[PDB]
Design a protein around this ligand. Structure first.
Ligand SMILES: CCN(CC)C(=O)[C@@H]1C=C2c3cccc4[nH]cc(c34)C[C@H]2N(C)C1
Length: 263
C-alpha cells in the first residue's frame, strides 16, 4: 500500500516543521530564553525525535506490512517509540507543574536561581524516567516474531502504560484543575478577556491531551484485560498526531512566539 506513504509523510513533515520552528524561535530571541520556554523546547525535542526516528519505521510497517530488517533493529524501534512518546507525555506533565508553580508559588517562580534548578531537575527527571521505562524492551523482553515487529508482552504493556500515561495523566489533570480553581479564586477576590483566554488555553491543552492519547491506552488496557484492528491503528496514529498539535497549542497563542515565527 503506497497510499499511506503520502499522508503519513505529510504528518511527519508537519511535526518536524512545527517543532523546528519552536526550537529556532526560542534559540534566536533573547526575550524568549526563559525556563518555561526551555520546558517547551524539551517537549519540542521529544516530538521532533518521534517524527525523525520512530515514525519512519511506522510508515514502513504500514506500507510493507511485515518486518524485513534485523530483530535487534525491531527492539530499537519499539524502545524508541515507547521512550519518545513517554518523554512527550512527561514533558506535558512537567509543563503543567511549572504553570502550577507560576500561580501557587509566584515568588519562587520569579527567582532565577531557584527556577533554573527546578527546570533542570524536571527535564533530567522526565528524560531519565522515559529511558528507564523503555529500557526493558532492549533486553529481549518483547516477544516479536521473525516476520512482525510488535510488542507481545501484556505484563509490560500494563506496567509501562500505567507509569508512562496514567499517573502523569491524573497528575496533569489534577494540577490544571487546581490552577483553574486558583484563577477563579483570585477572580472572585479582585481587559477581562485575558481571564477567559486562560480558561480557553487550559481547556484546549487538556482536551488535546485527552483526545489524542486516552483512546490508545484505554484500548490497550481493555485488550489486555475483540475490537477491529483499523481503529487500533488509527488510535496509535492519533497519539502520533499529539506531537503534531503540541507545538501549535503551546506556542502559537503566545504573542512573543508569534513575533518570532513571523520574523
Ligand atoms: C503497534 C505496535 N506499537 C509500535 C511499536 C506500539 O504499540 C507502540 C507502543 C506504545 C506504548 C506501549 C506502552 C507504553 C507506552 N507509552 C508510550 C507509548 C507506549 C507509545 C506507544 N506507541 C505509540 C505505539
Amino acid at each position: 500500500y503506497n497510499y499511506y506513504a503520502t499522508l503519513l509523510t505529510l504528518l511527519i513533515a508537519v511535526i518536524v516543521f512545527g517543532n523546528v520552528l519552536v526550537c529556532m524561535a526560542v534559540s534566536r530571541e533573547k526575550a524568549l530564553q526563559t525556563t518555561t520556554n526551555y520546558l517547551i523546547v524539551s517537549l519540542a525535542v521529544a516530538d521532533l525525535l518521534v517524527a525523525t526516528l520512530v515514525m519512519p519505521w511506522v510508515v514502513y510497517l504500514e506500507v510493507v506490512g511485515e518486518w524485513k530488517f534485523s530483530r535487534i533493529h525491531c527492539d530499537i524501534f519499539v524502545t524508541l517509540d515507547v521512550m519518545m512518546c513517554t518523554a512527550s507525555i512527561l514533558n506535558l506533565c512537567a509543563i503543567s507543574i511549572d504553570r502550577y508553580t507560576a500561580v501557587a508559588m509566584p515568588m519562587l517562580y520569579n527567582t532565577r536561581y531557584s527556577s533554573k534548578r527546578r527546570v533542570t531537575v524536571m527535564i533530567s527527571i522526565v528524560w531519565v524516567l522515559s529511558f528507564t521505562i523503555s529500557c526493558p524492551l532492549l533486553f529481549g523482553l518483547n516477544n516479536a516474531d521473525q516476520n512482525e515487529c510488535i510488542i507481545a508482552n501484556p505484563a509490560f504493556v500494563v506496567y509501562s502504560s500505567i507509569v508512562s500515561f496514567y499517573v502523569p495523566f491524573i497528575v496533569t489533570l489534577l494540577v490544571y484543575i487546581k490552577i483553574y480553581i486558583v484563577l477563579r479564586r483570585r477572580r472572585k477576590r479582585v481587559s477581562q478577556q485575558k481571564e477567559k483566554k486562560a480558561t480557553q488555553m487550559l481547556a484546549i491543552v487538556l482536551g488535546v491531551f485527552i483526545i489524542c492519547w486516552l483512546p490508545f491506552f484505554i484500548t490497550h488496557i481493555l485488550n489486555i484485560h475483540n475490537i477491529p484492528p483499523v481503529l487500533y491503528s488509527a488510535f496509535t496514529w492519533l497519539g502520533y498526531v499529539n506531537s503534531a498539535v503540541n507545538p501549535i497549542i503551546y506556542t502559537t497563542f503566545n504573542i512573543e512566539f508569534r513575533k518570532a515565527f513571523l520574523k
